[PDB]
Amino acid sequence: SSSVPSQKTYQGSYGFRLGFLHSGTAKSVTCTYSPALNKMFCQLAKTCPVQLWVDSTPPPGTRVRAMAIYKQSQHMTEVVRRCPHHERCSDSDGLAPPQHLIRVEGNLRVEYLDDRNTFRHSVVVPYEPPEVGSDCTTIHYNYMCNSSCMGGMNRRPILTIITLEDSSGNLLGRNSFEVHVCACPGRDRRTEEENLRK
Ligand SMILES: [Zn+2]
Ligand SMILES: [Zn+2]
Protein backbone atom coordinates (compact mmCIF):
# COMPACT_ATOMS: atom_id res chain seq x y z
CA SER A 1 0.00 0.00 0.00
CA SER A 2 1.20 3.52 0.83
CA SER A 3 3.53 4.36 3.70
CA VAL A 4 2.59 7.50 5.60
CA PRO A 5 4.43 9.45 8.25
CA SER A 6 4.02 7.63 11.58
CA GLN A 7 2.03 9.29 14.36
CA LYS A 8 2.90 6.91 17.21
CA THR A 9 3.70 8.56 20.52
CA TYR A 10 7.30 7.75 21.43
CA GLN A 11 9.02 9.51 24.30
CA GLY A 12 12.44 8.05 23.53
CA SER A 13 15.51 8.06 25.78
CA TYR A 14 15.12 11.74 26.66
CA GLY A 15 11.50 11.40 27.84
CA PHE A 16 10.22 13.76 25.13
CA ARG A 17 6.63 14.95 25.29
CA LEU A 18 4.60 18.03 24.37
CA GLY A 19 2.96 20.59 26.58
CA PHE A 20 0.51 23.42 25.81
CA LEU A 21 -0.38 26.65 27.58
CA HIS A 22 -3.51 26.80 29.71
CA SER A 23 -5.02 29.67 27.77
CA GLY A 24 -8.81 29.42 28.28
CA THR A 25 -11.75 29.63 25.83
CA ALA A 26 -12.72 33.31 25.79
CA LYS A 27 -13.63 34.84 22.41
CA SER A 28 -10.38 36.76 22.39
CA VAL A 29 -7.98 33.81 22.69
CA THR A 30 -5.76 33.13 19.70
CA CYS A 31 -4.48 29.60 20.51
CA THR A 32 -6.07 27.14 22.94
CA TYR A 33 -5.56 23.45 23.65
CA SER A 34 -8.16 20.84 24.65
CA PRO A 35 -6.84 18.00 26.78
CA ALA A 36 -10.11 16.13 26.24
CA LEU A 37 -9.45 16.15 22.50
CA ASN A 38 -5.66 16.46 22.36
CA LYS A 39 -6.44 19.22 19.90
CA MET A 40 -5.17 22.74 19.42
CA PHE A 41 -7.54 25.43 18.16
CA CYS A 42 -5.73 28.44 16.78
CA GLN A 43 -6.13 31.46 14.53
CA LEU A 44 -4.62 31.90 11.07
CA ALA A 45 -0.95 33.08 11.29
CA LYS A 46 -1.07 33.66 15.07
CA THR A 47 1.48 32.36 17.54
CA CYS A 48 0.97 28.77 18.59
CA PRO A 49 3.17 27.85 21.54
CA VAL A 50 4.19 24.20 21.77
CA GLN A 51 6.24 23.22 24.77
CA LEU A 52 8.93 20.52 24.59
CA TRP A 53 9.41 18.70 27.87
CA VAL A 54 12.30 16.31 28.43
CA ASP A 55 13.53 14.42 31.49
CA SER A 56 17.12 14.75 30.28
CA THR A 57 18.70 16.98 27.67
CA PRO A 58 19.16 15.77 24.06
CA PRO A 59 22.70 16.38 22.68
CA PRO A 60 23.88 19.18 20.39
CA GLY A 61 22.80 18.49 16.83
CA THR A 62 19.36 17.29 17.90
CA ARG A 63 16.59 18.93 15.86
CA VAL A 64 12.82 19.29 16.20
CA ARG A 65 10.62 18.83 13.14
CA ALA A 66 6.92 19.56 12.56
CA MET A 67 4.76 18.13 9.75
CA ALA A 68 1.02 18.09 9.12
CA ILE A 69 -0.94 15.08 7.84
CA TYR A 70 -4.63 14.58 7.17
CA LYS A 71 -6.25 12.55 9.98
CA GLN A 72 -8.69 10.57 7.81
CA SER A 73 -7.44 7.40 6.04
CA GLN A 74 -8.92 8.45 2.67
CA HIS A 75 -6.94 11.70 2.70
CA MET A 76 -3.83 10.52 4.51
CA THR A 77 -1.63 10.17 1.38
CA GLU A 78 -2.44 13.75 0.25
CA VAL A 79 0.25 16.30 1.04
CA VAL A 80 -1.11 19.00 3.39
CA ARG A 81 -0.34 22.37 1.83
CA ARG A 82 -1.32 26.05 1.99
CA CYS A 83 -4.09 27.16 -0.36
CA PRO A 84 -3.14 29.22 -3.44
CA HIS A 85 -4.93 32.24 -1.95
CA HIS A 86 -2.91 32.29 1.29
CA GLU A 87 0.33 31.72 -0.66
CA ARG A 88 0.00 35.37 -1.68
CA CYS A 89 -0.18 36.95 1.79
CA SER A 90 2.33 39.76 2.52
CA ASP A 91 4.38 39.46 5.74
CA SER A 92 7.81 39.99 7.27
CA ASP A 93 8.92 36.37 6.92
CA GLY A 94 11.81 35.97 4.51
CA LEU A 95 12.39 32.23 4.99
CA ALA A 96 9.25 30.14 4.63
CA PRO A 97 8.40 28.91 1.12
CA PRO A 98 4.89 30.08 0.25
CA GLN A 99 3.40 26.55 -0.02
CA HIS A 100 4.16 25.59 3.59
CA LEU A 101 1.24 25.43 6.02
CA ILE A 102 3.40 25.31 9.16
CA ARG A 103 5.99 27.95 9.95
CA VAL A 104 8.14 28.58 12.95
CA GLU A 105 8.47 32.16 14.14
CA GLY A 106 11.20 33.86 16.16
CA ASN A 107 13.91 31.42 15.18
CA LEU A 108 16.67 32.58 12.84
CA ARG A 109 17.90 28.97 12.42
CA VAL A 110 14.66 27.55 11.00
CA GLU A 111 14.84 25.36 7.88
CA TYR A 112 12.05 24.28 5.54
CA LEU A 113 11.99 20.93 3.76
CA ASP A 114 9.98 19.95 0.66
CA ASP A 115 10.88 16.24 0.72
CA ARG A 116 12.14 15.17 -2.71
CA ASN A 117 10.93 11.59 -2.26
CA THR A 118 7.66 11.99 -0.32
CA PHE A 119 6.73 15.57 -1.33
CA ARG A 120 5.78 16.26 2.33
CA HIS A 121 6.52 19.67 3.80
CA SER A 122 8.11 20.11 7.16
CA VAL A 123 9.75 22.81 9.27
CA VAL A 124 12.74 22.04 11.46
CA VAL A 125 14.77 23.91 14.10
CA PRO A 126 17.70 22.93 16.28
CA TYR A 127 16.68 21.63 19.69
CA GLU A 128 17.65 24.07 22.45
CA PRO A 129 17.55 23.41 26.21
CA PRO A 130 15.09 25.56 28.29
CA GLU A 131 15.78 29.29 28.67
CA VAL A 132 17.04 30.58 32.06
CA GLY A 133 14.37 30.00 34.73
CA SER A 134 12.26 27.77 32.50
CA ASP A 135 11.43 24.08 32.85
CA CYS A 136 10.74 23.56 29.16
CA THR A 137 11.67 24.66 25.66
CA THR A 138 8.91 26.26 23.59
CA ILE A 139 8.66 26.40 19.81
CA HIS A 140 6.34 28.99 18.33
CA TYR A 141 4.44 27.72 15.29
CA ASN A 142 2.10 29.57 12.93
CA TYR A 143 -0.49 27.84 10.69
CA MET A 144 -0.78 29.80 7.50
CA CYS A 145 -4.13 28.61 6.15
CA ASN A 146 -7.60 28.04 7.68
CA SER A 147 -9.29 24.69 8.07
CA SER A 148 -12.10 26.18 5.98
CA CYS A 149 -10.00 27.17 2.95
CA MET A 150 -11.52 25.43 -0.02
CA GLY A 151 -8.24 25.30 -1.95
CA GLY A 152 -6.40 23.78 1.01
CA MET A 153 -7.54 21.59 3.90
CA ASN A 154 -11.09 22.19 2.82
CA ARG A 155 -12.50 21.29 6.28
CA ARG A 156 -10.57 17.99 6.52
CA PRO A 157 -9.02 17.45 9.96
CA ILE A 158 -5.25 17.45 10.32
CA LEU A 159 -2.69 16.41 12.92
CA THR A 160 0.66 18.00 13.56
CA ILE A 161 3.48 15.53 14.17
CA ILE A 162 6.43 16.76 16.21
CA THR A 163 9.58 14.67 15.83
CA LEU A 164 12.79 14.88 17.83
CA GLU A 165 15.64 13.68 15.58
CA ASP A 166 19.41 13.41 15.51
CA SER A 167 21.53 15.43 13.08
CA SER A 168 21.00 12.74 10.41
CA GLY A 169 17.24 12.60 10.86
CA ASN A 170 17.06 9.41 12.92
CA LEU A 171 14.09 9.19 15.32
CA LEU A 172 14.67 10.22 18.95
CA GLY A 173 11.09 10.92 19.94
CA ARG A 174 7.64 11.73 18.53
CA ASN A 175 4.35 13.24 19.58
CA SER A 176 1.32 14.63 17.82
CA PHE A 177 -1.80 16.70 18.31
CA GLU A 178 -4.82 17.56 16.21
CA VAL A 179 -5.12 21.16 15.08
CA HIS A 180 -8.06 23.21 13.86
CA VAL A 181 -7.18 26.57 12.34
CA CYS A 182 -10.11 28.95 12.64
CA ALA A 183 -11.12 32.53 13.35
CA CYS A 184 -12.75 31.74 16.69
CA PRO A 185 -10.70 29.04 18.49
CA GLY A 186 -12.27 29.52 21.94
CA ARG A 187 -15.78 29.18 20.52
CA ASP A 188 -14.74 26.14 18.46
CA ARG A 189 -13.03 24.42 21.39
CA ARG A 190 -16.19 25.00 23.45
CA THR A 191 -18.41 23.57 20.68
CA GLU A 192 -16.29 20.46 20.14
CA GLU A 193 -15.92 19.73 23.85
CA GLU A 194 -19.72 20.13 24.14
CA ASN A 195 -20.22 17.75 21.23
CA LEU A 196 -17.89 15.30 22.98
CA ARG A 197 -19.92 15.47 26.19
CA LYS A 198 -22.92 14.54 24.04
ZN1 LIG B 1 -3.34 37.92 3.12
ZN1 LIG C 1 -5.94 29.26 2.86
Author numbering: 94 to 291
Sentences from the paper on this structure:
Significant variability, however, is observed in flexible regions such as the DNA-binding loop L1, which exhibits different conformations between the free and DNA-bound p53. A new conformational variant is observed here in the L2 loop of one of the two R273H crystal structures, referred to as R273H (form II) in Tables 1 and 3. The major changes are shown by the backbone conformation of residues 182–187 next to the H1 helix. Whereas the first Zn atom is of functional importance, as it supports the core-domain integrity and dimerization on binding to DNA, the second Zn atom observed in R273H (form II) is coordinated to C182 of one molecule, H115 of the symmetry-related molecule and the thiol groups of a trapped DTT (dithiothreitol) molecule. The interface between the two molecules is further stabilized by the side chain of H178 from one molecule positioned in a pocket created by three amino acids (H115, Y126 and P128) from the second molecule and hence interferes with DNA binding. In this manner, a continuous chain of p53 molecules linked by zinc atoms is formed in the crystal via the crystallographic 61 axis. Furthermore, the conformational changes in L2 as a result of the non-physiological Zn coordination disrupt the salt bridges between R175 and D184 that have been shown by most structures including R273H (form I) and by the previously reported structures of the wild-type (wt) core domain. In the conformational variant displayed by R273H (form II), R175 is engaged in water-mediated hydrogen bonds with C182, D184 and R196. The interruption of salt bridges via R175 (loss of enthalpy) and the incorporation of water molecules (loss of entropy) indicate that the core domain structure of form II is destabilized relative to that of form I. It has been shown previously that although Zn is essential for the structural integrity of p53, slight stoichiometric excess of free Zn2+ traps the p53 core domain in a misfolded state in which Zn2+ is bound to non-physiological ligands.
